[model samples]
Target chain A: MAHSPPGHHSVTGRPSVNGLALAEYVIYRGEQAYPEYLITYQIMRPE
Target chain B: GTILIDLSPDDKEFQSVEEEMQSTVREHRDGGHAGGIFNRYNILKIQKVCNKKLWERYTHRRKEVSEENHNHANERMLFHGSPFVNAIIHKGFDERHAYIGGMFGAGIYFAENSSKSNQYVYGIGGGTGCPVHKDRSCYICHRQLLFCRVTLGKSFLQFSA
Candidate 1:
């Protein structure tokens, strides 16, 4: 699994090593429409 | 106000969205636990131009957050399945109505896996199952999902729910 460069800060939780938690967010863009993109983001907290 | 754009079958964007969705399903199936399960859907890109205030606020916040967090806003694409998809398209996602005490603690929840998202669809053969149609002979429930653009900034990872 590949990832973007690490960010400056990390949150407090036991992050998964190699799974869905790896991605902070996912973005997919469409070329047909001008600046059209879909983003899937999550609001995270420790439970 | 909202505007909906329906992408044609030949549209590259349509294909891209469909491929991503199917690949998510494939990823789940190949995970070794959820074997022999398949997902099928009628793909339609009912693209939405969201509410003016909401769009502006979100974009403005995104810019500020991006600048604050070393410019790594961490934007991603995820699927959100809901029975009130029509309302979502029209009125935008309301976090207040979201389930309380969720794993991540309320707010809007999107799934990285298509199957995970599909679990929320309330229609024929879906999560809540189909409802009775009073007048019509065929009660066909059109299951739909929202392909959302998520902005995950400075996230904390939790392994278990």
Candidate 2:
């Protein structure tokens, strides 16, 4: 579960924006994966 | 970069699984702004090719995430919902708008479930699809969701509201 510092936003009963997090990076996929419609994007990968 | 392609039966990329996934998109058509069946005509493939400096920064972040997470790349395909599809396709993603008042915070938000993202899809005006004119009808009232690639290295998961 996403956690927040104790008493950080207890007043609002919610976590502040900084208390949350997400991945630093990601490559979107599913490019050309759909046969009937152009469905996604493409990216290069290094060997 | 972006590429628009028609997923025709003759195309090798056409597959039953891909077609099946699109069914999910079809189901949400009726809930949109217009009171008619909506159609999805084409698919767009979008990729961001960063400059040298940006590439290095991305690579470094990837390296750090992988090492910290026990060799897990931590990559996932996610859905980003937006009413202004043209703005995103023409320019790019900007986190500025989010900072003003985002429910989840200032960062870019994404959903793993298409149904969840579908909630954000909406028309522009009262029903005419024109932002400038409330009563004028445009060519079509359109909405789209961005299926994107997201790297969730180590996220703080919040189970409750």
In terms of lDDT, the best-performing candidate is 1
- lDDT for each residue of candidate 2 in B20-119, tens digit (9 for 90 to 100): 3344343332344441233332333333322343334445655665676677645555555555544554444444213133343444555444433444
Which one wins on TM-score? 1
TM-score of candidate 1 to 2 decimals: 0.65
What is the DockQ of the complex in model 1?
0.09
TM-score computed on alpha carbons, candidate 2: 0.48
The weakest ten consecutive residues by lDDT in model 2 chain B span B35-44
Q: lDDT tens digits, residues A1-47, model 1?
A: 11212552222233365454322222111110111222222211113
True contacts kept of 1: 0.09
Interface RMSD of 1: 11.4
TM-scores for all predictions: 0.65, 0.48
Interface RMSD of each: 11.4, 12.9
